[PDB]
Amino acid sequence: RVGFFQLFRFSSSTDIWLMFVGSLCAFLHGIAQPGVLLIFGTMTDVFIDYDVELQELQIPGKACVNNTIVWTNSSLNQNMTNGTRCGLLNIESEMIKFASYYAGIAVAVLITGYIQICFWVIAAARQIQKMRKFYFRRIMRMEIGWFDCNSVGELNTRFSDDINKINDAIADQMALFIQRMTSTICGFLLGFFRGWKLTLVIISVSPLIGIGAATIGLSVSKFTDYELKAYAKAGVVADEVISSMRTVAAFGGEKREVERYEKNLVFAQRWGIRKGIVMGFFTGFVWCLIFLCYALAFWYGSTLVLDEGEYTPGTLVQIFLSVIVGALNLGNASPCLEAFATGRAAATSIFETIDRKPIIDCMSEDGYKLDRIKGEIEFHNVTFHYPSRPEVKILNDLNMVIKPGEMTALVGPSGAGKSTALQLIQRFYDPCEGMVTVDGHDIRSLNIQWLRDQIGIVEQEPVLFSTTIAENIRYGREDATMEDIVQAAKEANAYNFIMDLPQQFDTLVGEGGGQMSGGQKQRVAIARALIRNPKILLLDMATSALDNESEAMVQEVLSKIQHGHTIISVAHRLSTVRAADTIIGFEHGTAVERGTHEELLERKGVYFTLVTLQSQSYQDSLRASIRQRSKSQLSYLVHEPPLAVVDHKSVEPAPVRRILKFSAPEWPYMLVGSVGAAVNGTVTPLYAFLFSQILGTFSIPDKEEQRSQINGVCLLFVAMGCVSLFTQFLQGYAFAKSGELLTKRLRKFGFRAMLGQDIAWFDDLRNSPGALTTRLATDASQVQGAAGSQIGMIVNSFTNVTVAMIIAFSFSWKLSLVILCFFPFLALSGATQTRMLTGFASRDKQALEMVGQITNEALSNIRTVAGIGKERRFIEALETELEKPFKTAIQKANIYGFCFAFAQCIMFIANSASYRYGGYLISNEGLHFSYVFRVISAVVLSATALGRAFSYTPSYAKAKISAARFFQLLDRQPPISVYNTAGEKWDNFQGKIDFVDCKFTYPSRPDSQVLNGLSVSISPGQTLAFVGSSGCGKSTSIQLLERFYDPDQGKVMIDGHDSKKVNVQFLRSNIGIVSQEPVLFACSIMDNIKYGDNTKEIPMERVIAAAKQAQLHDFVMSLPEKYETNVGSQGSQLSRGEKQRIAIARAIVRDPKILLLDEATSALDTESEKTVQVALDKAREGRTCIVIAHRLSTIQNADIIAVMAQGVVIEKGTHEELMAQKGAYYKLVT
C-alpha cells in the first residue's frame, strides 16, 4: 500500500537539505573506492617500467661496443636509436606523488564518510520524532470504539518497534545504499571504459556465480521448512509427554517416553546433515568458480590483449580490481533493500491510522455550547450495539428521562446493558438508532469538550496515574488550587487518610510505586470527580471492586454530600438504592419500571425480592534460530580483492570447557572439519601471493618465458579453485555432522533428565510445558554455535594470519613492520563498528522505555483519560519525553559517523604509508617491486580476516547461554528422584495407609493456604472418602500418597514405611490413580489400556478383563475399528465419559493395591455419570481406596468418611455413625 517515498512524508526543508548534502557526500565517497584503482593502475605501470629499465641496466655492457639502442647514456646527450630509455624515471619521486594522492583521498573519504552518516541519521531522527508525536496525537483523538477494536498491546508495538523499522529504512541504511550503488556503477563503468573486451569476458562468468549464490540463498529458506517439519516428528512426542507429566510419572512411563523421543530425533539429525552437505558443496562451488574466473581473467588479459600490445599491465590490474569491487559492492547492497522492504511494510498501519478520521474526537468546533444547564437528560428510542460486536444488540428502543437535581438508580441483570447507558451520556459511543438529549439539546451538535466537562464519573475500577496524589486529584480540574484539592479530599473522606501517609499529598501513587487500598483509590477517584463540581455525576458500580470493610467506607462517602447536581447510579447491591428518587429497571436492554422504591414493590419485584431473599509453540523460536544460524554460516562466501580497498560490512554463560567435554564423542568430525578450515584459511594469502607473482612476470624481458610463467600461475589458480571446492565441502559436511550429533545427544539427555525431575519442578512457571519444549527444541539446536563451527572459524583465521605473516616477513621484514602498524586498526574496525552499533541500539531502547511508560499508561486506561481525565495533558507529556531519544540519536549520529569515516579512511592511509616506504626500499635496498605488493596485500588481507573473526557476537553468546541452561538441568538433584536407588521393597505389599498430622504448602502457589493437621488411618482393603470441602486439603492427599510432593512436616506411612524413605518407583508402581480429567495418549485404545503396566508385556487377556470390568468392553467392541481404534489426534471423537472408562481400565489393569479416585464421575452428562459410577464401584472391590467425589453421600455410603474443610481431620466415621451424631456431615442434606 505504502510507496517507499511516502516514508519521507514528515521531512522538513531542513531535513531535505540534510538528506541532499548527505547523499552528495555518499556519492562522492562511493566514487572514491573504485576511482582509486586508476591511481593504482598507473602506479603499478610505473613500477613495471622501472623494473624493466633496472633489469636492462644489469646486462654487461651491450652498448659499450656499439651505440645500439637502450643503454644508460640515453639519459645523456647521445644518439641512442630508441630515444631516452633510462634515467628519467625516479621511482622515489613517483611514489611520493602517489602516496600524496592516497593521503588526499584518505582525507576526502574521512570527511565525506562522516557527513554521509551524520546528516542522514540526524534527518531520520528528526523525521521520526515528528512521526511519533503525530502518531500519538492522532491515537488519542480516536473514538473509544476504535480502541475497542485495536488492542493497546498492538499499539505499543506499533509505536515502538514498527516506527523503529521505519527508522532503519530512512536512516543511515539509505546513505549506505547510495554509496554502494554508486560504487558498483562506477566500478563497472571504469572497467568498461578502460577495456571492454576483458571486462565483458570476466563479466560473462557472472551467470554461473549468480546461479550458485541464488541456490545457496534459496536453499536457506527451502531447508528451514524441511528441518522444522523433520523435528516435529519428535516435538509432538515431547509436547504430549511433558503436557501430561503427572500421568507419565504415576504410571512410570519415563523410559518408554525417552525411547519414543530418541526414535524420532533421527529425522531432524538426517535433515541437518543434508542441509550441511548441500550448503557446504555450494559454497565450495562458488569459491571454485571465483578462482576459475581469476584464471580466465588473467590468462585472457595477458594473451593477445597485453602481450600483443593493446593493454598495459596497469590497465589489466585496474580493470580486474574495478570489476571485483563493483561486484562486491553490488552484493553488499542487498541488506539495504531488505531494510527498505521491511520499513515500507511496517509503515502501512502507522500511516493509515495517522490519516484516519475519528468519528468523534475532542475538538473545539464540533458544536454548540450551552450555559446554566439544568442537567436534565433524556433518551429517545436509543438502540445500540458495540462496534466490536455489532451482532448483539445491547439497548432496545430505550426510553428514559432523569430529572434535574435528583438521583436515579439503574437496576437489572448484569447482562442487560445496565452500565452501557452511562457510556452514551458521556458520548463514548453514538447510538446506532435514536437520540440522547441533555436539557433538550441533542448530544450531537454539543461541544464534546464542554459536554464531558459537565460530567464526572466514579469508574467501576479506580484508576490513578503515576504522579502525586495532589496531581492525581488536580487532573479533575486544571485550575484547582491546593485548598480546593483539600476541600475535595475532605468531601471524599480521603483527607484524614492521606495526611497519615509518610509524605502527605505529595506521595507518589503510581501503580509501580507505593500501593494503596482499593477503598482509598476509590476515594481519591471520588475526589477527582468532585473537584470538578460536575452537574451530572455518574456512579458506575463504584463499590463492585472493593472489599466489604472498604465497601462500607466508600458507600458512606457516597450518598452523604451529593445533592443539587443530578446523580445516575448503577448500584452494585440493591440494599442502598432506596435513597434514590427514581428507579428504572432494565430488561433485555429496555427500561421497564421507572418508579419509586415503594412502587418497585407494587408487585413481586422478582429481581429485588430475589436479591433481598438470597442476600438475606516452539516453532517460531526454532525457525528464528535456524534462519539466524544458517545466515551466520553464509558469511564464509565473503571474498576480498588483493590490493585495492577492502570490504567493510557484508543463567551465567557456561564455560566452553564443559561444551567441548560434552561434545568429545564426535571429535573425529571436528578434526576433519578443522583440517578443512585450516586449508581454506591458507587459501587467501596464497591467492594474494599468486596475484603478486602475476604482477612480477610482466617485467620479464623474454616474451616466451613471460607467457610460460603466466600460464603456470593460471594453472595454479585452477588447482586452487578445485582444492577450495573440495575443502569447503569437507569443512561444511564435517561441522554439520558434528553439530547434529551434538544436538541429538543434547536433546536426548535433556529430555531424559527432564523426565526425572520431581513434579514440583514442573509446576514452577519457569518450567512451563511450552517453555520446556522451547528449551528442548531451540536451545538444544543452538549449543553447536559454541562448538566445531566456532573451532572451524578460529582455525581458519589462525591459519590465514600465520601464513600471511610468514609470507610478509619472509619477503620483506622492514616493509612488513610498517604495514603491520596499521594491522590493529584494519582488524578491529569491523568489530568496533558492530559492538558500537549494538550498544547504541541498547541505549536507544533504554531511552524509548520512558516514552513507552507514558504511552502505555495513557492507552491502557484511555477511558479514564477521556471521560474524567485530561486528553491533551498526555500528548504534551509524550512530546516532552520524546526529546531524550532525539538527543541519543544525535550523539549516535556524531559517534557512528566518526567511527564509520575513520574505518573507511584508514585503509587509504595504510596504502599511502606502505607504498611510500616500498618506493624507498625499491630505490635503495634493492627490493623487487613485486615483493611490495606481496607483503602489503598479504598483511591487509590477513588483517581483514582476523577482524572478521571477532564478529561472533550474535550467536556464540546465546550458544553458551543455552549450554549453561542445559548443564544446570543435567546437574540438578531433585528432592524426589524416579531414577534413584532401589530400596524399601517388601514383597508382600498390603497397602495400609496412615497420615501423621501432615503439613503441606504448594510452591508455585503462594506459600499461604497451608494444609495442616491431616491425620487419618486406612486399614488394608478399606475405602476412605474426603467430602464436603470446597478445597483446603481435600485434593492434596492424592498427590501426597503418591510421591508427587513430600509433606512439609509430618509423615505419610505406607505399610509402616515412611513415605520419604520408600523407593518412589516401587511405591508408585503399587498405586493406581484416576484423575478428574482423563488424559490419554495418541496411541490405540489397547495401547492406552496397556500403559498401566508398561514394565511388562501383559497379554490381551488382562486388557479384555479390565475393559469388561470397567464397563468398557461392549462400547469399544462396537466401535468401527475396535480395540485398535486410535485416540486423540486420529480424529476419533470421544466424550469425557468414554475416556474416563479408558482411564479406569488403565488403572485397573495393573491390579493396584491402592486406588486414588481423584474426583472421577464428573462428566457433564448425568448419563455418563451413571455409566462411570458403576465402573468406579466395581473397581473399588478388594482394594485400599481413597475416593473423592463432588457428588453427595450416595457414592460414599459404602465405607468411612472424612468431612472437614480446614485441613485437620476432626470429624470421621462411617456414614451410619456420622449421620447419627448430627455433625457438619449434615450440610449435604441442608
PDB file of N, CA and C in Angstrom, residues 226-265:
ATOM      1  N   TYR A 226      11.905 -27.673   5.810  1.00  0.00           N
ATOM      2  CA  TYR A 226      12.081 -29.118   5.878  1.00  0.00           C
ATOM      3  C   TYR A 226      12.614 -29.541   7.239  1.00  0.00           C
ATOM      4  N   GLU A 227      13.555 -28.774   7.793  1.00  0.00           N
ATOM      5  CA  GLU A 227      14.036 -29.055   9.142  1.00  0.00           C
ATOM      6  C   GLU A 227      12.909 -28.962  10.153  1.00  0.00           C
ATOM      7  N   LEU A 228      12.130 -27.882  10.106  1.00  0.00           N
ATOM      8  CA  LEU A 228      11.049 -27.728  11.071  1.00  0.00           C
ATOM      9  C   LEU A 228      10.079 -28.895  10.984  1.00  0.00           C
ATOM     10  N   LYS A 229       9.727 -29.299   9.765  1.00  0.00           N
ATOM     11  CA  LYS A 229       8.857 -30.457   9.604  1.00  0.00           C
ATOM     12  C   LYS A 229       9.520 -31.721  10.131  1.00  0.00           C
ATOM     13  N   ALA A 230      10.848 -31.801  10.050  1.00  0.00           N
ATOM     14  CA  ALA A 230      11.544 -33.007  10.483  1.00  0.00           C
ATOM     15  C   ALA A 230      11.505 -33.154  11.997  1.00  0.00           C
ATOM     16  N   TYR A 231      11.808 -32.078  12.723  1.00  0.00           N
ATOM     17  CA  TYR A 231      11.837 -32.168  14.177  1.00  0.00           C
ATOM     18  C   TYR A 231      10.450 -32.379  14.757  1.00  0.00           C
ATOM     19  N   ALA A 232       9.410 -31.895  14.077  1.00  0.00           N
ATOM     20  CA  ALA A 232       8.062 -32.024  14.613  1.00  0.00           C
ATOM     21  C   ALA A 232       7.698 -33.477  14.864  1.00  0.00           C
ATOM     22  N   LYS A 233       8.341 -34.408  14.159  1.00  0.00           N
ATOM     23  CA  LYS A 233       8.065 -35.819  14.395  1.00  0.00           C
ATOM     24  C   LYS A 233       8.442 -36.232  15.810  1.00  0.00           C
ATOM     25  N   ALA A 234       9.338 -35.487  16.454  1.00  0.00           N
ATOM     26  CA  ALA A 234       9.696 -35.730  17.845  1.00  0.00           C
ATOM     27  C   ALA A 234       9.138 -34.656  18.768  1.00  0.00           C
ATOM     28  N   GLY A 235       8.955 -33.444  18.245  1.00  0.00           N
ATOM     29  CA  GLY A 235       8.363 -32.389  19.046  1.00  0.00           C
ATOM     30  C   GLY A 235       6.981 -32.754  19.544  1.00  0.00           C
ATOM     31  N   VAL A 236       6.209 -33.470  18.725  1.00  0.00           N
ATOM     32  CA  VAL A 236       4.892 -33.907  19.173  1.00  0.00           C
ATOM     33  C   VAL A 236       5.016 -34.833  20.370  1.00  0.00           C
ATOM     34  N   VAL A 237       5.954 -35.780  20.327  1.00  0.00           N
ATOM     35  CA  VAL A 237       6.134 -36.689  21.454  1.00  0.00           C
ATOM     36  C   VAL A 237       6.527 -35.910  22.699  1.00  0.00           C
ATOM     37  N   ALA A 238       7.468 -34.978  22.558  1.00  0.00           N
ATOM     38  CA  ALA A 238       7.899 -34.203  23.714  1.00  0.00           C
ATOM     39  C   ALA A 238       6.741 -33.411  24.301  1.00  0.00           C
ATOM     40  N   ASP A 239       5.961 -32.750  23.445  1.00  0.00           N
ATOM     41  CA  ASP A 239       4.849 -31.942  23.932  1.00  0.00           C
ATOM     42  C   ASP A 239       3.807 -32.807  24.622  1.00  0.00           C
ATOM     43  N   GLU A 240       3.470 -33.946  24.020  1.00  0.00           N
ATOM     44  CA  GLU A 240       2.483 -34.833  24.620  1.00  0.00           C
ATOM     45  C   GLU A 240       2.946 -35.319  25.983  1.00  0.00           C
ATOM     46  N   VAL A 241       4.208 -35.731  26.085  1.00  0.00           N
ATOM     47  CA  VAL A 241       4.692 -36.306  27.333  1.00  0.00           C
ATOM     48  C   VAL A 241       4.787 -35.240  28.415  1.00  0.00           C
ATOM     49  N   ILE A 242       5.362 -34.083  28.089  1.00  0.00           N
ATOM     50  CA  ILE A 242       5.523 -33.047  29.099  1.00  0.00           C
ATOM     51  C   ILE A 242       4.174 -32.495  29.535  1.00  0.00           C
ATOM     52  N   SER A 243       3.252 -32.283  28.596  1.00  0.00           N
ATOM     53  CA  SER A 243       1.950 -31.735  28.947  1.00  0.00           C
ATOM     54  C   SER A 243       1.176 -32.640  29.892  1.00  0.00           C
ATOM     55  N   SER A 244       1.427 -33.947  29.855  1.00  0.00           N
ATOM     56  CA  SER A 244       0.742 -34.905  30.715  1.00  0.00           C
ATOM     57  C   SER A 244       1.705 -35.567  31.687  1.00  0.00           C
ATOM     58  N   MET A 245       2.596 -34.788  32.299  1.00  0.00           N
ATOM     59  CA  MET A 245       3.702 -35.378  33.041  1.00  0.00           C
ATOM     60  C   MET A 245       3.224 -36.124  34.277  1.00  0.00           C
ATOM     61  N   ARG A 246       2.127 -35.683  34.891  1.00  0.00           N
ATOM     62  CA  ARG A 246       1.665 -36.355  36.098  1.00  0.00           C
ATOM     63  C   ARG A 246       1.265 -37.795  35.818  1.00  0.00           C
ATOM     64  N   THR A 247       0.580 -38.049  34.707  1.00  0.00           N
ATOM     65  CA  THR A 247       0.224 -39.422  34.368  1.00  0.00           C
ATOM     66  C   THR A 247       1.452 -40.240  33.994  1.00  0.00           C
ATOM     67  N   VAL A 248       2.368 -39.646  33.226  1.00  0.00           N
ATOM     68  CA  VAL A 248       3.597 -40.339  32.866  1.00  0.00           C
ATOM     69  C   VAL A 248       4.325 -40.796  34.119  1.00  0.00           C
ATOM     70  N   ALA A 249       4.440 -39.910  35.107  1.00  0.00           N
ATOM     71  CA  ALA A 249       5.076 -40.278  36.364  1.00  0.00           C
ATOM     72  C   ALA A 249       4.266 -41.342  37.090  1.00  0.00           C
ATOM     73  N   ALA A 250       2.958 -41.119  37.226  1.00  0.00           N
ATOM     74  CA  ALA A 250       2.134 -42.007  38.031  1.00  0.00           C
ATOM     75  C   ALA A 250       2.162 -43.432  37.513  1.00  0.00           C
ATOM     76  N   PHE A 251       2.365 -43.619  36.211  1.00  0.00           N
ATOM     77  CA  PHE A 251       2.430 -44.954  35.636  1.00  0.00           C
ATOM     78  C   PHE A 251       3.840 -45.353  35.228  1.00  0.00           C
ATOM     79  N   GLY A 252       4.841 -44.555  35.579  1.00  0.00           N
ATOM     80  CA  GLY A 252       6.217 -44.946  35.351  1.00  0.00           C
ATOM     81  C   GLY A 252       6.581 -45.144  33.900  1.00  0.00           C
ATOM     82  N   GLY A 253       6.176 -44.232  33.030  1.00  0.00           N
ATOM     83  CA  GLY A 253       6.482 -44.350  31.624  1.00  0.00           C
ATOM     84  C   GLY A 253       7.692 -43.585  31.152  1.00  0.00           C
ATOM     85  N   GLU A 254       8.541 -43.101  32.058  1.00  0.00           N
ATOM     86  CA  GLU A 254       9.636 -42.232  31.638  1.00  0.00           C
ATOM     87  C   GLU A 254      10.546 -42.930  30.637  1.00  0.00           C
ATOM     88  N   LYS A 255      10.895 -44.188  30.900  1.00  0.00           N
ATOM     89  CA  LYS A 255      11.760 -44.918  29.982  1.00  0.00           C
ATOM     90  C   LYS A 255      11.116 -45.038  28.608  1.00  0.00           C
ATOM     91  N   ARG A 256       9.828 -45.376  28.578  1.00  0.00           N
ATOM     92  CA  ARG A 256       9.133 -45.534  27.307  1.00  0.00           C
ATOM     93  C   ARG A 256       9.121 -44.229  26.525  1.00  0.00           C
ATOM     94  N   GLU A 257       8.842 -43.115  27.200  1.00  0.00           N
ATOM     95  CA  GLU A 257       8.794 -41.831  26.510  1.00  0.00           C
ATOM     96  C   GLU A 257      10.168 -41.425  26.000  1.00  0.00           C
ATOM     97  N   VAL A 258      11.216 -41.678  26.783  1.00  0.00           N
ATOM     98  CA  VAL A 258      12.561 -41.351  26.324  1.00  0.00           C
ATOM     99  C   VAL A 258      12.906 -42.159  25.084  1.00  0.00           C
ATOM    100  N   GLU A 259      12.572 -43.450  25.089  1.00  0.00           N
ATOM    101  CA  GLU A 259      12.823 -44.272  23.909  1.00  0.00           C
ATOM    102  C   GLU A 259      12.052 -43.752  22.705  1.00  0.00           C
ATOM    103  N   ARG A 260      10.790 -43.371  22.907  1.00  0.00           N
ATOM    104  CA  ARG A 260       9.973 -42.899  21.795  1.00  0.00           C
ATOM    105  C   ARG A 260      10.477 -41.574  21.240  1.00  0.00           C
ATOM    106  N   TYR A 261      11.069 -40.733  22.083  1.00  0.00           N
ATOM    107  CA  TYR A 261      11.636 -39.471  21.612  1.00  0.00           C
ATOM    108  C   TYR A 261      12.944 -39.706  20.861  1.00  0.00           C
ATOM    109  N   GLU A 262      13.777 -40.610  21.380  1.00  0.00           N
ATOM    110  CA  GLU A 262      15.004 -40.973  20.686  1.00  0.00           C
ATOM    111  C   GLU A 262      14.691 -41.529  19.307  1.00  0.00           C
ATOM    112  N   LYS A 263      13.655 -42.361  19.216  1.00  0.00           N
ATOM    113  CA  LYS A 263      13.307 -42.980  17.947  1.00  0.00           C
ATOM    114  C   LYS A 263      13.022 -41.945  16.868  1.00  0.00           C
ATOM    115  N   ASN A 264      12.602 -40.744  17.256  1.00  0.00           N
ATOM    116  CA  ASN A 264      12.185 -39.728  16.299  1.00  0.00           C
ATOM    117  C   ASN A 264      13.199 -38.608  16.113  1.00  0.00           C
ATOM    118  N   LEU A 265      14.208 -38.503  16.977  1.00  0.00           N
ATOM    119  CA  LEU A 265      15.243 -37.492  16.743  1.00  0.00           C
ATOM    120  C   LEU A 265      16.007 -37.718  15.434  1.00  0.00           C
TER     121      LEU A 265
END
